[PDB]
């Protein structure tokens, strides 16, 4: 793979039928969540992450803009995912801080379900990285 930058999409379990502010945004912005995502253990290999250079903390926050844009009470989980030809590498190291080496990586299709401030995103982002197949 190459470590690269691409246009992501969002997915949620939002209800089409109802008025809670960003249920309303998500129904017009995101797709439904697949109840069984893929999680593939990296055998053996290690890669270098950098929460500070992650252009998922660059597209997130632009969707948070359009969220409030039309917004004006409970948040639900939103997932961020990659298109064909790309995939998300996830760091499973427990004393990982955000940067440097990470021996236990795995690949995921979408991120975890995120409660909704760049720093609040990075509080959960840290372990995610995009590469191109």
């Amino acid at each position, epitope marked *: 793979w190459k470590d690269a930058d691409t*246009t992501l999409f969002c997915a949620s379990d939002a209800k089409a039928h109802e008025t809670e502010c960003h249920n309303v945004w998500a129904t017009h912005a995101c797709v439904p969540t697949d109840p069984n995502p893929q999680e593939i253990h990296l055998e053996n290999v290690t890669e270098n992450f950098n929460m500070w250079k992650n252009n998922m903390v660059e597209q997130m926050q632009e969707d948070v803009i359009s969220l409030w844009d039309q917004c004006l009470f409970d948040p639900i989980p939103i997932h961020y995912c990659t298109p064909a030809g790309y995939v998300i590498l996830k760091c499973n190291d427990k004393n990982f801080n955000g940067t440097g080496p990470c021996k236990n990586v795995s690949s995921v299709q979408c991120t975890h379900g995120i409660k909704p401030i760049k720093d609040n995103w990075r509080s959960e982002l840290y372990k995610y990285k995009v590469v191109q197949i």
Partner: antibody
Framework: QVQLQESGPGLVKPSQTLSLSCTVSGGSSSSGAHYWSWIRQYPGKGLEWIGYIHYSGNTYYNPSLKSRITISQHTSENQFSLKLNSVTVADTAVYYC???????????????WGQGTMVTVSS | VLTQPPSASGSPGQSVTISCTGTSSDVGGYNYVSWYQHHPGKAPKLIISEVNNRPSGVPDRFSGSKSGNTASLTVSGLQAEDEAEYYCSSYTDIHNFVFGGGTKLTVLG
């Protein structure tokens, strides 16, 4: 690379039931988080959204089609289809299949289209 | 359900603008206006998405906008290859879409 090929009848009798098939070829079908849509153009007129179905199996038809309509998928052979019922001469149009995206910067637009196939209703 | 003018013309080099009038629940209720270029007997090309966003491989000179309920597409610096028919669509309500009648952009020869 991902193109959309629509197959189907040219002619159908009134009151019958058109059904068209669109074959993806690049390219995902099931694989992606897109929407797989049917759009017809009345030559001139003229353009109208029929409905689409999502990789998850979620259908979304146009409200103005009072149950005259179902859409479905073959995750297998990377193709999908519309079945329009009780057709009258009104339903005579070119039918395009298209891929709807919910990627950011392309939200609720139709990035990939099919070249179109002409369908004529007549007794 | 959206409203465009039938024709729109300009000579080579000039700049041309195309209206697309909706309602407060169509355009002006959502920033999901799209524009499609349709050459005859060929598959329509998407050229503007989310109001004013050029996809990859779509030239610098096409541009979108909306004022209130009237979206608008501009083509700066005409060339022969721009002569075609242009439609606009907008998202509307829980999963629904509307289009315009289409506008014939004639590059005057």
């Amino acid at each position: 690379q991902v193109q959309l090929q629509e197959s189907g009848p040219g002619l159908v009798k009134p009151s019958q039931t058109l059904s068209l098939s669109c074959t993806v070829s690049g390219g995902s079908s099931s694989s992606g988080a897109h929407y797989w849509s049917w759009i017809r153009q009345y030559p001139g007129k003229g353009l109208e959204w029929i409905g689409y179905i999502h990789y998850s199996g979620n259908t979304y038809y146009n409200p103005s089609l009072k149950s005259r309509i179902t859409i479905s998928q073959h995750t297998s052979e990377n193709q999908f289809s519309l079945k329009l019922n009780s057709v009258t001469v009104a339903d005579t149009a070119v039918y395009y299949c298209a891929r709807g995206t919910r990627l950011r910067t392309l939200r609720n637009a139709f990035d990939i289209w099919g070249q179109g196939t002409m369908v004529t209703v007549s007794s | 359900v959206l409203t465009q003018p039938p024709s729109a013309s300009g000579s080579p080099g000039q700049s041309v603008t195309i209206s697309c009038t909706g309602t407060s629940s169509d355009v002006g209720g959502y920033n999901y206006v799209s524009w499609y270029q349709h050459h005859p007997g060929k598959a329509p090309k998407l050229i503007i998405s989310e109001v004013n966003n050029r996809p990859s491989g779509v030239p610098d000179r096409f541009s979108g906008s909306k004022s209130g309920n009237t979206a608008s597409l501009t083509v700066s610096g005409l060339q022969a290859e721009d002569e075609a028919e242009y439609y606009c669509s907008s998202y509307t309500d829980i999963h629904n879409f509307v289009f315009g009648g289409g506008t014939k952009l004639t590059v005057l020869g």
